[PDB]
């Protein structure tokens, strides 16, 4: 890294809040990255760590870092179902319609796992409803095809 850089992957990942603190206080560089390409938002981000996700943006984090696979931390938070997560990405400038590389969004990512209030919210904050994936396949066609038809309804 950092030393502190991968210190601080680890506590945003395990959602040690503290440690994040102390870490970034003494000098952790806030956009360290793994060996997937994961920042520490990434990390704190996919697995429901809000006061980090929180801490890290304040604190200069790049709201849209891409992975090595082309996943940003609202691709992330989206798929995984954390919808408040979502909500502060997009509040802190978060691509709503960042592509990866099979060119999901996140609107398809949460179309696909049947987050229907993160659809939502996606889509009020200007998700391309129509946007299509590297199969043709739009966020209404994943909603279907997951047997995810209340969400369905809302893509329509």
Do not use: C, W
């Amino acid at each position: 890294g950092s030393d502190l850089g991968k210190k601080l992957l680890e506590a945003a990942r395990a959602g040690q809040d503290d440690e994040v603190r102390i870490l970034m206080a003494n000098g952790a560089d806030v956009n360290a990255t793994d060996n997937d390409g994961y920042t520490p938002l990434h990390l704190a981000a996919s697995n429901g760590h809000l006061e980090i996700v929180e801490v890290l943006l304040k604190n200069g984090a790049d709201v849209n870092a891409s992975d090595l696979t082309g996943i940003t931390p609202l691709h992330l938070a989206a798929a995984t179902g954390h919808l408040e997560i979502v909500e502060v990405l997009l509040k802190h400038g978060a691509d709503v319609n960042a592509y990866d590389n099979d060119g999901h969004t996140p609107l398809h990512l949460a179309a696909k796992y049947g987050h229907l209030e993160i659809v939502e919210v996606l889509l009020k904050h200007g998700a391309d409803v129509n946007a299509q994936d590297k199969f043709g396949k739009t966020a209404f066609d994943i909603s279907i095809d997951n047997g995810n038809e209340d969400l369905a309804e809302i893509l329509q």
